[PDB]
């Protein structure tokens, strides 16, 4: 019956984002994309320790899904016969039957297609939700990625004036829960199952063994940091399907920020420290004026040094001694 | 002194809130409540798990106060003989004397009346507070409620259009610490006195064993499920007098949301998830678009599906196909 | 080059803050301020629980440092030869170099010099930060303090109005993570290398054994309780460097509350309980209104009354009976 243009993503693995406009002239269309979940074995830290996890397209988090106010959404959600659980999608962008996880439970072999109104602007949630405990225990083995609604006029700061940034980043946020031998040894597993009884007794506790960005400690350093130019403005997106974080970029700002993640609400202006309650999603953009390297963090320091959670900016351009300066290096007290 | 007309209300129990109105022609009244406190053994799981409570009105969460700005509260609170500790009530609505406490600890035995000016529009919490240590034993026992105080003109948007509910519901979300013995089941105790060495120690180390609305596991669930129906606008009062909570309405969204409480601040729009700080009440409202079953939770989904931060809406009406549908049911791979 | 005047600043220690103008005339200047590390075995609590602290300047938190926009704050570091890490400084509130922590590394017997314009209004925290499992151990440890940047105008209400405080206090609440021992009781070490092996295993653990304000358990009361009158509009700055907070005056409200600390946004009003996310200050004013003893707390009622995290004010001048009156003492009931 719906009756409208349809165009296909070709979805990007985190902590890039899809090529899209942010202001368009485009009215609705039907925007399809394909999430194929895959169960898999993966390391979490440069130690070695693994993990099981359950991923939609492989990744933790899941791709970035980007589209306009009014478009309608069609994912095709695939789970092949060579995953052990059934699995579905739920979207806090959507309105009705459990965000869509009452249509989309699919057991291995299984597709399903879901198309939902994006009716709410902003960045938003979408994970796994089968049932009962398996709610929390598919969350926080991977099953959650994030999903932004643009206003058709792109960003705007509640002033009247756009906001247009020049590149985009998607940091998904993942508490991990691995048990210990009574030595004290992380523990492997054969499977998700073999995993469960003790993983969701850990769970019960509240406390994660590691705290990661993009699915594994200094993902997002070395070769793959983040990296920025000294007058470009970059918008963060950051997501926590089940636990708070705090988010802080050291040496910069939150110029503007939607903590609570939703475009219908003016942005704060010069944070320092923002907060994504867990179960949502959260933007920050910020121009960079200095060059050098940046620690992009949640300011649980505990959590960010020693769980897992920091990623870095290595930024490009010409330092500003003006802004800051080392008026006299180290030298022995007179 | 005060020469004001006196009106009385008939508490109802959690999660109803006694009859209203949100816009009023009344002036200041001297609005006459009485709380009577009750010590009990309860039942919080479903595997009959006991917890000794003390409790407002022999509910958990105590009962939702609804007045108007510039009202007067007079409260009458009785700590029957019946019980074995003494108690107080503190508002964080009212002004003076830590909220009320100061003035109102009664023994077994006694009552006292306490009234105060509500000068401060929103949802808020009351609890007791007797002193010491027996502050956050008390609370964390049952003993905390709420009190919403409406502009006489009532809601707005901060745009100057009056948001009108249908109807409201308050969920109070209590975090309860039962310890175990050596095997590991959860322990019952004689009376709350036997119960606060072992508690106290447990409290001390943060983690709760339960997380609940309204008392118990699924208190909110089954046969009394929150009820709307396509079209209605649904208020949702929260409280969390002890720590923090992130309600989601899983296929809802908040419409407008006051996540802090308070009504002198417009509401943000078009939320996910929102925050509740512990020692705060937040309100939410949603106009329902879609029938079928939502879950309200906390959206750490480890405490609302495993510790059991879960209620249920049941939701009549007419399918919306236009907001979401499904395209093509679960159906083998291609 | 930069030809600017001088002005130094004598630094006081929490919860006092040095003198300054809200509103003022001058423009632009070089703000001079010293902070001298020390390393320093202290006393926590009543029990006589000791603490391998690191202090900027002697005390948790650090001194409130005060400019207005635009000026230029320059800091002498000093790391006296009788400490025995090296130490540096990261100021939320600045733009470049890890926030000034890549520019004051310095060894004991060392001191370096460090200017940062201020661009940013708020208040912000600021931190030792030397790298990597460091960071949080020196934050944890004590190493931290705060900064406010006022507007040259003074502070204002978001809908034209000045807001005048009378007095300013500066709360920094602190996290500790003290390892106790087989039979329960809590260590003391010989040097904060000593103590860093079981401190680093706990933190990791994420839960506090003492979360505290100015340092200590009980700093905040007594001949050291907070003061106001009847009347005064009281400003109270509070930071937390490393995990939330949820800040609450026991028997007040925050009239104008800033909760993630930023001037550059409007003030909320009328709050119960605001919000610190760790890694930030925030801000709050109110008007007392009534006389007698208030308790100002994080309304995680376990960490205030039995973790250390409450503070005492006493407040003189007359009791309003038309906002709060006992109005039957405690009797036998009827
Ligand atoms: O983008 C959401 C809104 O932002 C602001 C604009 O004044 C308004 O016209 C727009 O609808
Ligand atoms: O309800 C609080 C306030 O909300 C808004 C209105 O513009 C204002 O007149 C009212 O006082
Ligand atoms: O203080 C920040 C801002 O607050 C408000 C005022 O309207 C504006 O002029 C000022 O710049
Ligand atoms: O940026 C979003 C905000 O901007 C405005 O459209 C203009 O102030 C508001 O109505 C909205 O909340
Ligand atoms: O909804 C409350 C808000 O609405 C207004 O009255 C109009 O914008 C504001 O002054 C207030 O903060
Ligand atoms: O108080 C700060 C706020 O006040 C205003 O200047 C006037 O509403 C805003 O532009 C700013 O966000
Ligand atoms: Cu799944
Ligand atoms: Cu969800
Ligand atoms: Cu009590
Ligand atoms: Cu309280
Ligand atoms: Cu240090
Ligand atoms: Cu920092």
Request: negative net charge; contains cysteine.
């Amino acid at each position: 019956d719906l009756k409208l243009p349809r165009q296909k993503v070709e979805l990007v693995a985190p902590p890039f984002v899809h090529a899209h406009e942010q202001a368009t002239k485009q009215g609705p269309k039907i925007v399809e994309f394909k999430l194929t979940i895959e169960e898999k074995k993966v390391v979490i830290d440069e130690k070695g320790t693994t993990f099981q996890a359950m991923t939609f397209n492989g990744s933790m988090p899941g791709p970035l899904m980007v589209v306009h106010e009014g478009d309608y959404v069609e994912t095709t959600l695939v789970n092949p016969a060579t995953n052990t659980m059934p699995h579905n999608i739920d979207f806090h962008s959507a309105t009705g039957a459990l965000g869509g996880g009452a249509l989309t439970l699919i057991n291995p072999g299984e597709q399903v297609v879901l198309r939902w109104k994006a009716t709410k602007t902003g960045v938003f949630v979408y994970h796994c939700a089968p049932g009962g405990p398996m709610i929390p225990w598919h969350v926080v083995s991977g099953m959650n990625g994030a999903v932004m609604v643009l206003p058709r006029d792109g960003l705007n700061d509640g002033k009247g004036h756009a906001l247009k940034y020049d590149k985009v980043y998607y940091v998904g946020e993942q508490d991990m829960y691995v048990p210990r031998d009574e030595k004290g040894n992380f523990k492997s597993y054969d499977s998700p199952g073999e995993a469960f009884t003790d993983t969701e007794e850990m769970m019960k506790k509240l406390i994660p063994s590691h705290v990661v960005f993009n699915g594994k400690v200094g993902a997002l350093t070395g070769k793959n940091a983040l990296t920025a130019n000294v007058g470009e403005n970059v918008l963060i997106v950051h997501s926590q399907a089940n636990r708070d974080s705090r988010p802080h970029l050291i040496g910069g700002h939150g110029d503007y920020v939607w903590e609570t993640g939703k475009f219908g609400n003016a942005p704060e202006v010069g944070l320092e420290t923002w907060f994504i309650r867990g179960g949502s999603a959260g933007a920050a953009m910020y121009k960079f004026m200095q060059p050098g390297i940046y620690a992009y963090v949640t300011h649980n320091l505990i959590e960010a040094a020693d769980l897992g959670a920091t990623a870095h900016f290595k930024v490009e351009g010409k330092w500003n001694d003006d802004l800051m300066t080392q008026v006299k290096a180290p030298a022995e007290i007179p």
